[PDB]
Amino acid sequence: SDLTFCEIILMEMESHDAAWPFLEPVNPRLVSGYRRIIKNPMDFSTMRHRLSRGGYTSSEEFAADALLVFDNCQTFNEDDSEVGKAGHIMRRFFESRWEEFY
Ligand SMILES: Cc1c[nH]nc1CN1CCN(c2nc(-c3[nH]c(C)c4c3CCCC4=O)cs2)CC1
């Protein structure tokens, strides 16, 4: 049940218009400095893969990964960049849907 809400929220983030930067891992070969700056990469397919495996104990671990996506985004991208702007939309989406359950 704690993971049935995570399925709902992850499904809704995956299909969100602003999700396009976060659907697959950043490729550090294409992004100068990414590997140096982002210690713990995270993205939605990685969360999906881990949810399919059953690798989440509670919903808080799920939220930890979600929040990590948007912490990384705000660490690497300017708030007015195209990726930064998408990340703010996705972050506010996640925080609001999360509170709409817990
Ligand atoms: C499914 C879809 C919908 N619209 N377009 C597509 C296909 N996409 C094509 C473009 N793409 C892209 N991701 C990024 C991306 N993401 C993050 C979290 C980034 C970056 C840049 C470096 C900084 C950073 O932290 C840039 S370009 C991947 C997917």
Side-chain angles (χ1 to χ4, degrees):
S1 171
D2 251 18
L3 287 93
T4 205
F5 293 158
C6 303
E7 290 281 355
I8 297 176
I9 193 163
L10 182 49
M11 165 197 67
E12 282 167 352
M13 290 190 301
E14 282 175 330
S15 51
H16 199 290
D17 282 349
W20 62 267
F22 312 108
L23 292 171
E24 62 174 18
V26 172
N27 187 345
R29 290 167 175 178
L30 308 165
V31 182
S32 177
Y34 196 77
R35 195 204 305 281
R36 171 176 51 85
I37 287 174
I38 292 303
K39 293 309 177 305
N40 303 113
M42 185 53 59
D43 69 284
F44 291 168
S45 78
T46 301
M47 297 166 60
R48 165 62 59 195
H49 289 353
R50 182 176 174 188
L51 195 52
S52 298
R53 224 201 313 124
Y56 291 112
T57 298
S58 61
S59 72
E60 282 70 17
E61 296 181 346
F62 179 87
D65 274 354
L67 290 184
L68 181 57
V69 181
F70 309 126
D71 287 335
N72 291 340
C73 181
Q74 288 171 93
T75 296
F76 196 86
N77 306 265
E78 302 259 55
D79 297 311
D80 59 357
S81 66
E82 201 68 13
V83 170
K85 289 191 278 184
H88 285 303
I89 294 177
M90 289 309 304
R91 185 184 44 81
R92 283 187 299 264
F93 183 80
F94 173 77
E95 286 184 15
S96 79
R97 276 299 281 159
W98 176 270
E99 271 143 46
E100 209 159 357
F101 285 141
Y102 317 94

